[PDB]
Every structure is written in structure tokens, then in C-alpha cells.
Amino acid sequence: IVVLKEGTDASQGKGQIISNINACVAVQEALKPTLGPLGSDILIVTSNQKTTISNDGATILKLLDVVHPAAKTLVDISRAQDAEVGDGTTSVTILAGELMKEAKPFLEEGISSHLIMKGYRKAVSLAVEKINELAVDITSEKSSGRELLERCARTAMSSKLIHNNADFFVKMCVDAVLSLDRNDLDDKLIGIKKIPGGAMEESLFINGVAFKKTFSYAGFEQQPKKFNNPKILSLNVELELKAEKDNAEVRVEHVEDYQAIVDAEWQLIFEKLRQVEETGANIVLSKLPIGDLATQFFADRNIFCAGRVSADDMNRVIQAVGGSIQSTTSDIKPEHLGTCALFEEMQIGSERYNLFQGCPQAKTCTLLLRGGAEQVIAEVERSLHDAIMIVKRALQNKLIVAGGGATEMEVSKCLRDYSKTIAGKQQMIINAFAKALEVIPRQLCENAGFDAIEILNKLRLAHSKGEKWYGVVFETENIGDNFAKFVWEPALVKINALNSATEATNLILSVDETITNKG
Amino acid sequence: TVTCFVRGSNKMIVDEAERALHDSLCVVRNLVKDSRVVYGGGAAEVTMSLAVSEEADKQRGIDQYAFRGFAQALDTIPMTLAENSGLDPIGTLSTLKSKQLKEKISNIGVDCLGYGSNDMKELFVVDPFIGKKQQILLATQLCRMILKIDNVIISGKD
Amino acid sequence: RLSKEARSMEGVQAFIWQEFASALEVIPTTLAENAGLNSIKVVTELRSKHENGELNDGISVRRSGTTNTYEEHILQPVLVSTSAITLASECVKSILRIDDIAFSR
């Protein structure tokens, strides 16, 4: 009659560890096509009904929301990969899951997982030491300031639809990173706006901030769109004649009183409307719509206004001209105003776009992209995001290691020799760790269409011949040196990946039982 | 601004005549924007197929199977037009090929509208060249995007 | 050669005579599969050498690749391949000519 769990499912034993292994393979198998710049993209449909397609492991695992506890640990460690580094969230989960696959036959042989986890901790400790030996300090050495940024951005943009126009896109990509303080570089500070229509090579770089120009209200052919030093005013409240929401009940029996209450509704609005002119600002920006009466009164005094501007764009305006948002039109102070070097409304893409240009106080920028289709430009923007992260980390981190299979093979190469000196179960565990490091160069060839059998075996040949820098060429299929091909990643990525993947692996291998309470 | 005044004996007749006129306005917009024109019905997909099929042997690789299938995929459009017009899709397609090979490379299309011959020139069936280029582009672009997706995960509605 | 000769025809003669040439590719495909060689790769390499060169280039299991089969002393008499397509066309005919199977005693 009595029950221990009161109907709360709890399972233990070696079968629970196997169930944790199958969960790590399921998460790995989903991220395998998303590994590498040429890797395939995953189709994810969230319960929010927003269909997204991306290859970035961070965004992928955040939108899946896997309830499985052992599989959720691989998601939590991927968010740590997005925190400590921010790049490589796809490879850290695949490598951690591969450690679960290589530890599966050891569980059937009767080898305890604690000796397996202890073997990885000694393997990573030797692996990080080899990465420090593979860390090459380079700043001005055999490279200039311009060639270091350009030649590294061309490789990230290679094998893409932008390959032919890459010469123009590297110039805007390098100038985008140099437009910000090299001490603190944030990808969020670089704005990117997609412009439908037009040629890809005609894209422009804006030093200031731009937005969509969502103003739908009539009164056009006025309010000149080109200003030299406009005074930008950030507004909150609603200046439209006929208001959005509220109202009032007024009972009057006279005809002159009918026109009076209509003029009263006008005078109450015109009061705060005239206070905008008393500030003497040429640009009026508000997150709420600016009605026909307001845009007409601004047209007579030659004041430009745009309503219903996104909040994300208004925050960049504050970071551009150094202004501030004031709630009312009365108390507006002079320091809340701001000014740019040039203001123009561009018709590029058969659509009107307001832009601020030449802001000396701007901590952010905006880069416009053009193309024949909105989906193609989105691929250009994401291929640019991969190029920005390489250019950004090049200045922030001067210690680099050869990527694209180069470093992955050298770490796996030496640990096979280090395992010869160690005897016992730890020898087969280190050999399994070095074998688990072979999944990274493998999936890079499988996702790009290259043959995994020939290229990997040929890579194991020349790399064993005394040259440590041989990677996998992503352009023309062959083995080659990525140090010459300029495939570069900082040493902190390879160190934090081996530390985070083994950590998440050690947390899952240490779980004998999963207790889930229902309620 | 101009206002096109449209009438019809029935609702659907008004909406059909209005959208048919709007379809002509989109053609005139492309004819003025780009003076380059081709005769597009049944002619373009065959000429595109005959040129790629000849160059497929010179490429010598994975592209040879991709270009051969690309020419066969282009042949779907004229065969589909022949199936909608009540003609043999296999017989009409090859008939258009032999006329564009044994004689000369030109625009000879499907008989769908009807004439004494299959020529699209004297029949005055024309499509914008910028319209035919964007049609074969976005079609290939999405085909690469569908093959770009190696995994599909769809959740429920909460 | 037959695929290029089918482009000079009209009507039905264009479509089906292309499929007959594609059905001839099964022989080199099974030779590459049974020998462990890559199906798609080896066929494209032989289709590459047959546009410039000639019949001498073929699959050789001794060299584990594509080389000259005349210098490797691999020689198939013409009657074997002649009696092959001939008996194959008579078999496929006798099959398609059978529209039904009825029990008759």
C-alpha cells in the first residue's frame, strides 16, 4: 500500500547514465550541421510563433528550451561560452557531447566514470599547456595596421555570395571596428540596417545612427530633410490634434460654444505644441506619433519631425548626439538637445530613411546594407557578423592560434604521445580524449561537403611529419596551412572551450540518478 | 497621380479587370526601367537549357550533374505550359528545341495562346529581361536556402 | 556519344533516347561500387577523359583508380558488349509486351 515516491518519477543505475548519453548525442546531432562558417542552418519554430533560422549555437539552444536536465546542462554551458567568450557556442557543445560518446564503450567495459572524468582533467591540463605553446604574439610583426584587419576579414567573407564584392565590404567592416574605441569594442554598438532593393556594392557606412522613418502622416513636400547643424529634440507626449485614447464630455447649447470647445481642444494641444518652437529645435523625435497638426505647425517654421520611432533606435540617438529624453515640452533644458554634422533623408531602396551623420560624441554607428532581396541581405549581415567578430578579437587579443583544424590536430597529436608514458586505464581515456578531438575537423569537412575520410587521413599525415600548422582549407578542398590562409582564433577561445566542454562533461558523467518531482 | 476607373458586370469581374490592368502596369514599369527585352513564354527555358546542356560536358565534375539537372529543371516550365494548353509536354518541348537548333537560336514558344506557328516574335508575347533574370535568381536562391536547412525542429502552440 | 546524337532529333526521339544512355551508366557505377571507389567521383573522371581522349581510359582495379586499361591488359571482345545490349533490348521488350498474367489450365 505504501509508496516511496508518492508518484514522483526517479530512475537510477547505469541505465540513467546511458539515458544521459543519448541526450547529449541528441543535442550534439542537432548542432553538427551548424558547426563552421560553411555549416548548414537549422530551422527552429518557437512556441512564440516566430520562425528563426540561424547557425549560431547560442541563439539555437536558447530557442529550443530543452526540458531534459542532462541536455539542459549543455545549454547552460553554452550560455557560459557566450559569456566568457561569445563565440564558439556550437563547437563547445559538440566537443562536450563527443566526450559522452567516447565514454560510452568505457561504461560497458565496467570502467568507472570518475576515473574517466579524472583522465579528462589531466588531458585538458596538458592541452591548455600546448595551446600556450601554440599562442603566437603578433602585432606589427610582418603585418601593417591596414593589412592585419583587411586580410583577416577577407577569409571570413570568403566562400560567400559576397566573395566578388568582398573588396567593398571589407572596407566598411574595417572602418566599422575602427569607428569605435579600440579599448572597448561591442558588437551591439555597431548598427546594421537592411535596405531592400539596390545593388550590393552601393552600400554606405554611416558614422551616426539611422532609423526606419516610420512616419505615416500627411503634410509632405515640406519640412526640409537636409540640415547642417540641426538641434535634435527628444519628445515623449502626443502632439496630434485628435488624440489617441482619452476624451471628455462637454455639454454646450450654443453654436459659438461648439466652435469654442473645438478650439479648446486645439488650444490645449497648441499650447504644448508652441512650446516645442520656443525651444528652437530643428529635429523633433518621439516614440509616440506626431500628428498632422504638429507636423504642419513644424512645417511653417521649417522644423522636421518623425514620430513612432523605435525605442532601440532612440537609445542610439542618445549615444550619438549626447542628448536626453524629456517628458514634457515645458521644462526642456538646453543640455538635452543634440546636433550632428549632417542630416539627410535618403530615398535609397525606394524607401525614406532618416540618418544622423558626423556625430563626434557618438559611441555607436550604423552600417547600411543593400541587395536584390531581403533574404540575401540577411545572409550578408550574418556573414558580416562572423567577419566583425574576427576583426574585433584581432585587436582585443594579440595572442592567436591557427584555426580551421590546425590547433585541433596539434592538441590531439601530442596527447596521443603523452598517453604512451601513462599506463593503466588513464591511457585509454586520454586516447579517447584525443580521438574525441577529431570530431571538430571532421564535421568541418562534412558540413562543407568535403570528404571526411580522405581529407582527415591526409591531414593526419602531413601534420605528423613535423609541421604543426596544417589546417583544412575551406575554399579549395585540400590540406594546407591556415597560418598562411589567415584562419585565426585567439588562444582564449581554445582554452575556454576545452575547460567548459570538459566541465559540462564532468557534471553529466557524475549524475547517477535524475529525480523529478511532479507538481 | 492618376486614377484608373474600372467597372464590371460583377464583383469578381471588377477585381479581375482591376488586377489584370495592374499586372500590365508592372510590365510597363519593367519595360521602361530596362529596355532589354526577351520573348519569355516557352522560349527562355529552352534556350537556357540548350546552352547549359552543351557547357555541362566542359565543366567535368559535380557541376556536370548539377548543370544537367538544372537544364532539366528549366524544362519543367515549358512542359507545364504545354500540359495546361492541351499539348504533349514531351513532344512540344522537343519540337521547340529542334527549331532552335537545326535552324538558329531564337525565341520560339509554346502554342498556349495559339497561332499558325510557335514563334513568339510575330505573336508579340514578350517578357522583361530584368524580370526573367530576377525570376531565375530568387528561384535558385531559395532552393539553396531549403538545402541549407539540415535540421527542422517545430514546437507546439502554448 | 548517343546523348549528343539525340539532340539532333525531334519530338519523342529526343526524350527517351536520353534515358537509354543514362541506363548504360549502371555498368561503370557497379564496377566503382564493388571496388570501393567513389561512384560519383570515378564516373565524372571517366566522362572527363572520354571528351578529350578515347576508349583506352577506364576503371582498373589493379591501379585502384582511373587509368589506361589497354596498357593494363584488360581487354573485352566486342561481341560480349554487342550481344549484351542486344539481348538486353529483347528482354525489356518481352517484359513490357506482357500487359497481364492470367491463370490458364
Side-chain angles (χ1 to χ4, degrees):
Chain A
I1 295 170
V2 296
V3 295
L4 297 176
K5 62 182 179 181
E6 293 182 352
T8 58
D9 291 344
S11 296
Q12 63 178 18
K14 293 177 179 177
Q16 184 63 59
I17 296 171
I18 295 171
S19 296
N20 291 336
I21 294 170
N22 291 336
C24 295
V25 176
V27 176
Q28 185 177 357
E29 184 68 14
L31 295 175
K32 291 177 179 177
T34 60
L35 177 62
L38 296 175
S40 296
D41 292 345
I42 186 169
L43 176 61
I44 296 170
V45 175
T46 59
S47 64
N48 291 336
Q49 294 178 336
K50 182 178 179 180
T51 299
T52 59
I53 296 170
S54 178
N55 61 344
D56 181 66
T59 301
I60 292 169
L61 295 176
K62 292 176 179 177
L63 296 175
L64 294 175
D65 291 344
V66 177
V67 67
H68 190 280
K72 184 178 179 180
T73 301
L74 296 175
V75 177
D76 290 344
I77 192 65
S78 64
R79 294 182 182 175
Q81 185 64 58
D82 182 67
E84 295 177 351
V85 175
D87 187 6
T89 59
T90 300
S91 63
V92 63
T93 301
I94 295 170
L95 178 62
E98 184 67 14
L99 296 175
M100 296 299 294
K101 183 178 179 180
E102 295 301 321
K104 183 178 179 180
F106 295 160
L107 178 63
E108 295 177 351
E109 295 301 321
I111 295 170
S112 178
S113 64
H114 300 289
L115 296 175
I116 297 169
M117 293 182 286
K118 181 62 174 172
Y120 295 143
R121 294 182 182 175
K122 292 178 178 178
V124 175
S125 296
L126 296 175
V128 176
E129 183 178 2
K130 301 303 287 185
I131 295 170
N132 291 336
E133 296 301 321
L134 295 175
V136 176
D137 186 5
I138 181 170
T139 59
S140 64
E141 297 301 321
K142 293 177 179 178
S143 179
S144 64
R146 181 178 181 171
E147 295 301 321
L148 177 63
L149 297 175
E150 292 178 350
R151 293 182 181 175
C152 295
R154 294 182 181 276
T155 300
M157 294 178 181
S158 178
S159 296
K160 302 298 183 181
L161 295 174
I162 62 173
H163 186 278
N164 290 336
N165 290 283
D167 290 344
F168 296 159
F169 294 159
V170 173
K171 294 176 179 177
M172 294 183 286
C173 183
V174 173
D175 290 344
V177 177
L178 296 175
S179 64
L180 297 176
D181 187 5
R182 291 174 296 181
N183 291 337
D184 187 6
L185 293 174
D186 187 5
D187 290 344
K188 294 177 179 177
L189 295 175
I190 295 170
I192 295 170
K193 302 299 183 181
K194 292 181 294 296
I195 296 171
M200 293 176 70
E201 62 184 343
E202 294 178 351
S203 295
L204 296 175
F205 177 80
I206 303 301
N207 291 336
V209 62
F211 58 90
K212 185 179 179 180
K213 180 60 174 172
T214 59
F215 178 78
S216 296
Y217 296 138
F220 294 158
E221 294 178 351
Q222 294 300 321
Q223 295 178 336
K225 62 183 178 181
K226 184 178 180 180
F227 292 158
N228 290 336
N229 290 283
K231 294 177 179 177
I232 296 170
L233 177 62
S234 296
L235 181 63
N236 191 341
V237 297
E238 294 177 351
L239 295 177
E240 67 277 1
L241 177 62
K242 303 299 183 181
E244 183 67 15
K245 295 176 179 177
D246 59 352
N247 57 32
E249 294 179 351
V250 176
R251 181 180 180 274
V252 293
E253 294 178 351
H254 299 290
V255 175
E256 294 178 351
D257 290 344
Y258 294 141
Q259 185 63 59
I261 61 172
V262 174
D263 290 344
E265 293 178 350
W266 181 89
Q267 185 63 59
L268 294 175
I269 301 301
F270 177 79
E271 183 178 2
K272 294 176 179 177
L273 177 62
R274 183 177 181 171
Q275 294 178 336
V276 177
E277 182 277 336
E278 294 178 351
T279 301
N282 291 283
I283 301 301
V284 176
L285 296 175
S286 178
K287 294 176 179 177
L288 294 177
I290 294 170
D292 291 343
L293 176 63
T295 189
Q296 185 63 59
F297 177 80
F298 294 159
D300 291 344
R301 299 299 298 275
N302 291 336
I303 295 170
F304 179 80
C305 56
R308 292 178 63 85
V309 178
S310 178
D312 290 344
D313 291 343
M314 292 299 294
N315 290 336
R316 295 182 181 276
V317 174
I318 295 170
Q319 294 178 336
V321 296
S324 178
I325 296 171
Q326 184 63 59
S327 296
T328 59
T329 60
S330 64
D331 290 344
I332 296 171
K333 293 176 179 178
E335 72 279 5
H336 298 166
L337 296 175
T339 185
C340 55
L342 178 63
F343 176 79
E344 185 178 2
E345 183 177 3
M346 295 302 295
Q347 294 178 336
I348 294 171
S350 296
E351 184 177 2
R352 294 178 179 84
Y353 295 136
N354 289 337
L355 60 84
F356 297 159
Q357 187 173 355
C359 296
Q361 295 300 321
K363 302 299 182 181
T364 187
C365 296
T366 299
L367 176 60
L368 297 175
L369 295 176
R370 297 176 64 182
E374 294 178 351
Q375 294 300 321
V376 176
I377 298 169
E379 296 301 321
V380 176
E381 181 179 2
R382 294 179 182 173
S383 64
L384 177 63
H385 295 165
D386 291 344
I388 293 171
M389 294 184 286
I390 301 301
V391 176
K392 179 179 76 179
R393 295 183 182 277
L395 296 175
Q396 294 299 321
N397 291 283
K398 302 300 183 181
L399 296 175
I400 61 171
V401 296
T407 301
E408 292 81 357
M409 292 301 294
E410 180 64 13
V411 176
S412 179
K413 180 180 178 181
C414 295
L415 293 174
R416 294 176 64 185
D417 291 344
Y418 296 142
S419 64
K420 294 177 179 177
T421 59
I422 295 171
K425 294 177 179 178
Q426 295 177 336
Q427 184 173 355
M428 294 183 286
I429 295 169
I430 294 170
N431 290 336
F433 178 81
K435 183 178 179 180
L437 295 174
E438 296 300 321
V439 65
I440 296 170
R442 182 177 181 171
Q443 295 300 321
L444 293 175
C445 296
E446 294 178 351
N447 291 337
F450 297 161
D451 188 5
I453 295 170
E454 294 301 322
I455 301 302
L456 178 63
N457 289 336
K458 293 176 179 177
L459 178 62
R460 293 181 182 175
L461 296 175
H463 183 63
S464 63
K465 293 177 179 177
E467 295 301 321
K468 297 174 179 176
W469 290 273
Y470 292 143
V472 176
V473 177
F474 296 159
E475 295 178 351
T476 299
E477 183 179 2
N478 193 30
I479 59 172
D481 184 3
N482 289 337
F483 178 80
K485 301 303 287 185
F486 295 158
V487 177
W488 292 354
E489 293 178 350
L492 295 176
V493 175
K494 301 303 288 185
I495 294 170
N496 290 336
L498 295 174
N499 290 336
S500 296
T502 301
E503 182 179 2
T505 300
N506 291 337
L507 294 175
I508 296 170
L509 292 174
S510 64
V511 175
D512 59 351
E513 181 178 1
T514 298
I515 295 171
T516 299
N517 290 336
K518 294 176 179 177
Chain B
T1 187
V2 296
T3 299
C4 295
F5 178 77
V6 177
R7 296 283 290 176
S9 295
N10 192 30
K11 183 178 179 180
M12 294 300 294
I13 295 171
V14 176
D15 290 344
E16 182 178 2
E18 182 179 2
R19 293 179 65 85
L21 178 62
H22 182 62
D23 290 344
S24 296
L25 296 174
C26 296
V27 175
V28 177
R29 181 179 180 274
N30 290 336
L31 296 176
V32 176
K33 183 178 179 180
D34 186 5
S35 64
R36 293 173 296 180
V37 297
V38 296
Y39 299 138
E45 295 83 358
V46 176
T47 300
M48 291 173 68
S49 296
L50 295 175
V52 174
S53 296
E54 294 177 351
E55 296 301 321
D57 291 344
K58 294 177 179 177
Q59 295 299 321
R60 296 181 182 175
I62 304 301
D63 290 344
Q64 186 173 356
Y65 295 141
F67 295 163
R68 181 179 180 274
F70 178 79
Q72 294 300 321
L74 294 172
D75 291 343
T76 300
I77 303 301
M79 291 178 70
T80 300
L81 297 175
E83 292 177 350
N84 291 337
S85 63
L87 296 175
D88 187 6
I90 294 171
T92 300
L93 176 63
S94 175
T95 300
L96 299 176
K97 293 177 179 177
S98 296
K99 293 181 181 297
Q100 294 179 337
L101 293 175
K102 294 176 179 177
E103 294 178 351
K104 185 179 178 180
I105 295 171
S106 63
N107 291 283
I108 295 170
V110 188
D111 193 7
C112 294
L113 293 175
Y115 179 71
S117 179
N118 291 336
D119 187 6
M120 293 296 103
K121 183 177 180 180
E122 186 177 2
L123 182 63
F124 296 156
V125 177
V126 63
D127 289 343
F129 177 80
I130 190 65
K132 301 302 287 185
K133 182 179 179 180
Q134 294 177 336
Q135 185 174 355
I136 62 173
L137 178 63
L138 296 175
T140 301
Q141 184 64 59
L142 179 63
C143 181
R144 296 177 63 185
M145 293 177 70
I146 295 170
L147 296 175
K148 184 68 180 296
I149 295 170
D150 188 67
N151 189 340
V152 174
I153 295 170
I154 296 170
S155 63
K157 294 177 179 177
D158 291 344
Chain C
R1 294 182 181 276
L2 178 63
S3 178
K4 294 176 179 177
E5 294 176 351
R7 294 182 182 175
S8 63
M9 294 177 181
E10 184 178 2
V12 177
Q13 295 171 337
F15 178 79
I16 297 170
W17 280 261
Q18 293 177 336
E19 295 301 322
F20 178 81
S22 296
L24 297 175
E25 294 178 351
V26 66
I27 303 301
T29 299
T30 58
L31 293 174
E33 293 177 350
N34 290 336
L37 296 175
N38 189 341
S39 64
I40 302 301
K41 183 178 179 180
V42 173
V43 176
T44 57
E45 292 177 350
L46 295 176
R47 292 178 64 85
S48 298
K49 294 176 179 177
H50 296 166
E51 183 67 14
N52 288 337
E54 62 184 343
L55 177 63
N56 290 337
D57 290 344
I59 294 171
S60 178
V61 296
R62 181 177 181 171
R63 297 294 181 190
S64 296
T66 59
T67 187
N68 189 340
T69 58
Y70 177 78
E71 294 177 351
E72 295 301 321
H73 299 290
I74 295 171
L75 298 175
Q76 185 174 355
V78 64
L79 179 63
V80 177
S81 296
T82 300
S83 63
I85 298 170
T86 299
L87 294 174
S89 64
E90 296 301 321
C91 182
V92 177
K93 180 180 178 181
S94 63
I95 293 170
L96 296 174
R97 289 178 65 86
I98 295 171
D99 59 351
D100 188 5
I101 295 171
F103 178 80
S104 177
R105 181 178 181 172

